[PDB]
Amino acid sequence: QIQLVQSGREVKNPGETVKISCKASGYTFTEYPMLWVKQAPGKGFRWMGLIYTNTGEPTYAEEFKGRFVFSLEISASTAYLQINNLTNEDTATYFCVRDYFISLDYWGQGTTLTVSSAKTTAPSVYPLAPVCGGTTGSSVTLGCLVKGYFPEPVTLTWNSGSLSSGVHTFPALLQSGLYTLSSSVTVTSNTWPSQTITCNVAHPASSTKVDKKIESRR
Amino acid sequence: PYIADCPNCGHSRCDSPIAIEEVRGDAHAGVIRIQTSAMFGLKTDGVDLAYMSFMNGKTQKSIKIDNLHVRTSAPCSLVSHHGYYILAQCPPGDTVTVGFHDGPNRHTCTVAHKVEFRPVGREKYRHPPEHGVELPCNRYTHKRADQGHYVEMHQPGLVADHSLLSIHSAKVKITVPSGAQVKYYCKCPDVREGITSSDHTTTCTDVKQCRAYLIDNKKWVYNSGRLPRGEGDTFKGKLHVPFVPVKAKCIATLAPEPLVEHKHRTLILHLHPDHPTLLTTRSLGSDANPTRQWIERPTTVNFTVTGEGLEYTWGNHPPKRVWAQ
Amino acid sequence: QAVVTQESALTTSPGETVTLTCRSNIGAVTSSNCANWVQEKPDHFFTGLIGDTNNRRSGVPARFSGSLIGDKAALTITGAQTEDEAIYFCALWYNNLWVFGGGTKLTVLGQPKSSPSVTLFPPSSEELETNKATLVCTITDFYPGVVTVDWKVDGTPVTQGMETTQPSKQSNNKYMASSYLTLTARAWERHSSYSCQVTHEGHTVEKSLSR
Amino acid sequence: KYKTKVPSPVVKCCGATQCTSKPHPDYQCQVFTGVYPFMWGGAYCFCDTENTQMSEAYVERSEECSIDHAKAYKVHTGTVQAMVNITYGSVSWRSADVYVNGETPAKIGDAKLIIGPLSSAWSPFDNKVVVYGHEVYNYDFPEYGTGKAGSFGDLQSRTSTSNDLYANTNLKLQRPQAGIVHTPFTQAPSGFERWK
């Protein structure tokens, strides 16, 4: 019914601008305005303002009057947050939210911004296959290591997303100035290596797409 | 919910959110349409007309309507509220006197306004009865689904709030509501506009010589005379009126029937009304020779009826007619 | 210019009744504050529970009810469930803006413990072609969500080279984490026995590779 | 009856704000100094005589003007009518609307009938007439554009839609008292209030 799906997470060096979209589904856009909330890493939840999706007038919280600008692609049921002249302390997650029932009833997924200086490094995608010997159980765990990229984000799927059950994707972590991510997938021992299992990785900032099929070590 | 300066706010001139402007005792049905500067109705967000949002602080308080009181010479009867605006059935009164009860405090507002309620009809009652004829009165609606007029409602100007101007242990310290736009400087030379988060004040020290302002134009207001202009612009915010004056047929007046008595080309009429009744006639000759007199005291009257006829109007009771040959 | 305050953390057991409160620094909370309650489950997952003090969002179990108790807004979970373990935030309206509380972390007894599923992978060969080798140790489906990961190259506790992520909550409400041990193509070829040891709710699991 | 729908006055805190004669009907506006306007925090303008207050008020049609409104007319003679029944002869029926001008037939039924012109040209309406809802007054209304304030026709709008009008209401703003925000509008209640 109601889905507010947000854009993916960006990386931006200080000074830049970002436009975060919120695409609304399930309600009539026009009778319910949008709340923009900032949940800062430590600090907790904060109201950034509200936009009248009918007239188009924004209210900003005083903390947010200035670099922040709400707007909407009415026509497509999108509300957008734009933060100009990005300050380093704006790294946090921003949620769109529907104001209804004397409060807020639905929250989006969040779009996380990491304001940070750094060039652009494409990831190296490495297959993780089991040890050279044996590996005999009722199931089997394969993996995919996405190493050394910048900036965030990368997306990772298994078999173009048709294999989602039994998957653990591990949050990217910064190490020596670069991000590293990994994912595991577990399937029955009959599936692999009988049927092909492929790691799909995209790094938008570098226009890098890598498809890596997990092959047996021998 | 706008806040303005009530004139005799219990003690004297306070600043009540329910500051009464535009009293309209101009209809007939015992009703007055009023505007509070407070916007009761739904809450801040979305629910239940029968809740209650006035301004406390810079802030609203969107809660229950529990103990509203409009009143005049006597306590009125609410009819309906919508927006800034309430309709209430009142008796006549030299003044108008409004007020709810938040619960900790009475917190009322009162005003002068000449009120009367003539019903439509040649009877000058003081009050609508249970019976009588219906006829075309002027009156306001119960409802909200209403567009017949709209009043300009653009932004608020700033407002004072010296709760902001605290002290930074030697300097006067302004803060902000939510990142709102605080327009600031002091008599001394320091920051001269103020479009900021919480500032300090390098130069001046005294709270009593500084600009505690709130440009908080995220929500428009009614354009009360007791509003300071938002100097920037005529922002948008054309906004309807609910309580349009409509052509209701009030349940309305009727005066007791006359006692018709015959004489030679003459109507003696022993007469005995309930209230002051405007009687009048028209001797149907091209000589009209009409008569008018409000009758409240019972009176035996007379009418030299002619050959061709006369007519007779006992209040809004229908006109009679008479052959006196 | 108002401060909403909430309990920091509350612990209950499945089947109990627990009350969370929301206090305003300016005065009693009233119906014109339109108390809202929002729940945050792991993964930045937000849902609204109650609005306008006591209106339950649609599709929120009835075990959840809101009210004003004394001078504060309250959320009562009647028959708390294991699934209710999350962060609950209250929001209060103040005539022109919203102020959110700090949130209450609620813990509910349930979800029987679960041992981790550990897997250690060898450096792939395309990576050994870079003059680098990274042993990945993945640990998933463990609960409670706290582990100790220790690496041991050739019998000797490695102590530099490793990085272990922080336990992240999976969907089923169990946790996961991975640890990396980066060697050089060369360090790789030198030593011969690698092992990733994971300690969880007292049992140990060692996964060793042999080059 | 008018409605003094006051636009919200300006308050410049230190120095003058000259007013201009906006084209609103009877746009009364008068600058005022020497205030100290108590607005929710005590006063707010930090000066004490340079505190300036510009009051402005114009006249506007009431909402009742659309519906509860007197109505003037210049009345000429026109042409009189009738729903003449004739239950004729053996025809026994025709109830037809006719005229008076002495060459108009009305072939409704079967008979052709020519009426008048009547000799009794007394139009009971006078030349000038005011009209109100149902009570019609053969009143010498002063005119559009002229009506003395308080007297009938202080407000004079051509029609209800007509944004332009003539508002001689003698609307005179006075300075607000003792450093408080409000708008003294001193005005005659309407010559539509009286006249009722």
Author numbering:
A (entry chain C): 1 to 218
B (entry chain B): 501 to 825
C (entry chain D): 501 to 711
D (entry chain A): 50 to 245
Task: Show the paper's wording.
Here, we report a 4.4-Å cryoelectron microscopy (cryo-EM) structure of eastern equine encephalitis virus (EEEV), an alphavirus that causes fatal encephalitis in humans. The icosahedral shell of alphaviruses consists of an outer layer of trans-membrane envelope E1 and E2 proteins and an inner capsid layer separated by a host-derived membrane. Alphaviruses utilize the E2 protein for attachment to incompletely characterized receptors (Schwartz and Albert, 2010, Zhang et al., 2018). Endosome acidification triggers conformational changes in the E1 and E2 proteins that generate the fusogenic conformation of the E1 protein (Gibbons et al., 2004, Haag et al., 2002).
